[PDB]
């Protein structure tokens, strides 16, 4: 039937983290950076469509701190930051709370669809939320269409407009601002599309804008062919960004177009090991010196689509940087341990340049310098195969990151690079269905 085609789901999440970082300015001491244990739990109601045209979605989640070390920095992004609004962030605490993260009317008419309210991007644009356990929330609306041409392929495109955002670690929405936190950005919007040729070749691209400030670009080619009866997946991705403020002020981020280009190769060997080989290439001349996939520069103020994620702490998005990643996920099912997996991954990055200019350079600022970053991580995963708690997943991740330079964190004209690090994450994820 219609709106009593509804569903009600949710989950309970546990997160325990210990991360420390090298302090080059205090005798190379590795010091406590993050140390906490936090709970999350959510509830998600999604209606059917009445007359196949009208629906309602409502969802909320809560964070409840258990443990926190005194020397832990903030925000840890799992709890709520003590600062409700992103542009008020002052880095001094975390707290418990309840946040309404979905609150939307949804519509369907023919091949057309729309959502308006408290929403996440779901179509073809380059707007995106941050993801903790739960996603961030935009205030705005999205509309799109899907046109199926059978074997000829299928086309879909969509448009999203928004004027406020909250990251999953913020209890309230905030408006958008330039890099100075005071010049107003009236809205973010984005149009994008996707063509599926039905031959395992897919094209996607999208254009975005932050009103009066930034133009953002996305493009991705995907292909899947079989080698030895198993799919080898491949893709080239292009991410670019431009601003409209070239006057050497605090708001001028990029000289000329900034971009990140990526190549992707994936393959499952012997139906038992997931294999990843990926590389990225970044250009970011100007004052910032690193690429951002989001159209607002301030931390947590918005987010954009980025299909590249290596879970090795660094962003590897510095001005000249080139980087390579290999990861292996070994399914232990043939040791008769189905649902256990173990993995390791490794990143090496070189040719990392700093910003091309600085208004307040520091002692380490050398415009022609290049540095290298590297990292490796180990992974252990277990999903409960059956019983009362079938689906419950336990996860343990360890990362060691090395900077390869004596430059203290955030210094030397590398605004998005921190010092050497060892990070350990343990999470439990326990879904549930009410309807
Ligand atoms: C039934 C749902 C039960 C859970 C709701 C929990 C409260 O959820 C909370 O509502 C408050 C207050 O309106 C929202 O707050 C909202 O209104 C306030 C003004 O009062 C704005 O400053 C804020 O930016 C906006 O988000 C938070 O976004 C939301 O998380
Ligand atoms: Pt606290
Ligand atoms: Pt420009
Ligand atoms: Pt500029
Ligand atoms: Pt180092």
Ligand 1 binding site (Cβ under 6 Å of any ligand atom): 60, 98-100, 171-173
> Contact, 378 vs 398, CB < 8 A?
yes
Q: How far apart are CA 68 and CA 35, in angstroms?
A: 6
CATH domain 7-433 topology? Porin (2.40.160)
Extract the tokens encoding 340: 């256990």
Torsion angle in degrees (nearest 10) through CA of 101, 76, 308, 60: -10
DSSP annotation of 260 reads: E
Extract the tokens encoding 7: 């569903």
Question: Gap positions in the chain, given as the residue before each gap (C–N > 2.5 A)?
Answer: none
Q: Which of 173, 174, 176 to mutate to test the pocket of ligand 1 (most atoms within 8 A of CB)?
A: 173
Chain centre to alpha carbon of residue 25: 31
Q: Can you say whether residue 245 is alpha, beta or left, with left for phi > 0 and alpha for psi between -120 and 50 degrees?
A: beta
Q: How far apart are CA 17 and CA 35, in angstroms?
A: 5
Documented resolution in Å: 2.1
- Domain spans of the chain? 7-433
Extract the tokens encoding 285: 């001349």
Q: Where are the beta strands (DSSP E) in 83-229?
A: 94-95, 97-109, 112-119, 137-148, 154-166, 176-177, 184-185, 188-196, 201-210, 214-227
Q: How far apart are CA 216 and CA 396, in angstroms?
A: 35
Q: How far apart are CA 40 and CA 427, in angstroms?
A: 11
Q: How far does the centroid of ligand 1 lie from the alpha carbon of residue 98, in Å?
A: 9
Three-state secondary structure of 336-358: CCCCEEEEEEEEEEEEECCCCCC
Instruction: Of 84, 71, 95, give the one whose Cα is nearest residue 23.
Output: 71
Instruction: Of 268, 264, 194, give the one whose Cα is nearest residue 234.
Output: 264
Q: What residues does 207 pair with on adjacent strands?
A: 191, 217
> Contact, 267 vs 317, CB < 8 A?
no
CA angle at 240 for the pair 128 and 130, rounded to the nearest 5°: 20
Q: How far apart are CA 167 and CA 84, in angstroms?
A: 10
**Way the structure was solved:** X-ray
Q: How far does the centroid of ligand 3 lie from the alpha carbon of residue 277, in Å?
A: 34
Q: How far apart are CA 235 and CA 222, in angstroms?
A: 4
**In this structure, are strands 7-23 and 29-46 parallel, antiparallel, or unpaired?**
antiparallel
Positive or negative CA dihedral for 304, 310, 313, 315?
negative
> Contact, 116 vs 190, CB < 8 A?
no
Q: Where are the beta strands (DSSP E) in 47-84?
A: 54-68, 80-81
Cis peptide before 75 (omega within 30 of 0): yes
Ion ligand 4 nearby residues (CB, 5 A) = 243, 246, 252
Residue 103 alpha carbon, nearest atom of ligand 1: 2
Q: What is the largest CA-CA distance in the chain?
A: 68
């Amino acid at each position: 039937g219609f709106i009593d085609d509804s569903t009600l789901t949710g989950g309970i999440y546990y997160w325990q983290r210990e991360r420390d970082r090298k302090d080059v300015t205090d005798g190379d001491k590795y010091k406590t950076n993050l140390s906490h244990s936090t709970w999350n739990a959510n509830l998600d109601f999604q209606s059917g469509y009445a007359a196949d045209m009208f629906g309602l979605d409502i969802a909320a989640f809560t964070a409840i701190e258990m443990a926190e070390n005194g020397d832990s920095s903030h925000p840890n992004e799992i709890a709520f930051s003590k600062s409700n609004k992103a542009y008020d962030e002052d880095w001094s605490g975390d707290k418990s709370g309840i946040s309404l993260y979905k609150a939307a009317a949804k519509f369907k008419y023919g091949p057309v669809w729309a959502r308006a309210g408290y929403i996440q991007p779901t179509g073809q644009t380059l707007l995106a939320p941050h993801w903790s356990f739960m996603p961030g929330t935009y205030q705005g609306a999205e509309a799109g269409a899907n046109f199926d041409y059978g074997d000829a392929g299928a086309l879909s495109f969509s448009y999203m407009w928004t004027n406020e955002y909250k990251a999953p670690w913020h209890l309230e929405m905030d408006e958008f601002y330039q890099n100075d936190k005071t010049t107003k950005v009236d809205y973010l919007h984005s149009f994008g599309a996707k063509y599926d040729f039905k031959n395992n070749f897919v094209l996607e691209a999208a254009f975005g804008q932050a009103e009066g400030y930034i133009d953002q670009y996305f493009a991705k080619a995907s292909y899947k062919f079989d080698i030895a009866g198993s799919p080898l997946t491949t893709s080239y991705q292009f991410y670019g960004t431009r601003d409209k403020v070239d006057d050497r002020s605090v708001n001028d981020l990029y000289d000329g177009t900034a971009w990140l280009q990526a190549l992707t190769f994936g393959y499952r060997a012997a139906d038992v090991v997931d294999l990843r080989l990926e590389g990225t290439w970044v250009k970011a001349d100007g004052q910032q010196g690193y690429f951002l996939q989001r159209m607002t520069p301030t931390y947590a103020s918005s987010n954009g689509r980025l299909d590249i994620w290596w879970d090795n702490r660094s962003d590897f998005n510095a001005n000249g940087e080139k980087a390579v990643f290999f990861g292996a996920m070994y399914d232990l099912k043939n040791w008769n341990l189905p649902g256990f997996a173990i993995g390791a991954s490794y990143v090496y990055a070189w040719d990392a340049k700093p910003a091309t200019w600085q208004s307040n350079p520091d002692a380490y600022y050398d415009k022609n310098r290049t540095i290298e970053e590297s990292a490796y991580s180990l992974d252990a995963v277990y999903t409960i195969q059956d019983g009362r708690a079938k689906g419950t997943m336990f996860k343990l991740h360890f990362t060691e990151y090395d900077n390869h330079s004596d430059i203290p964190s955030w210094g030397g004209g590398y605004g998005n690079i921190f010092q050497d690090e060892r990070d350990v994450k343990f999470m439990v994820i326990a879904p549930f269905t009410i309807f």
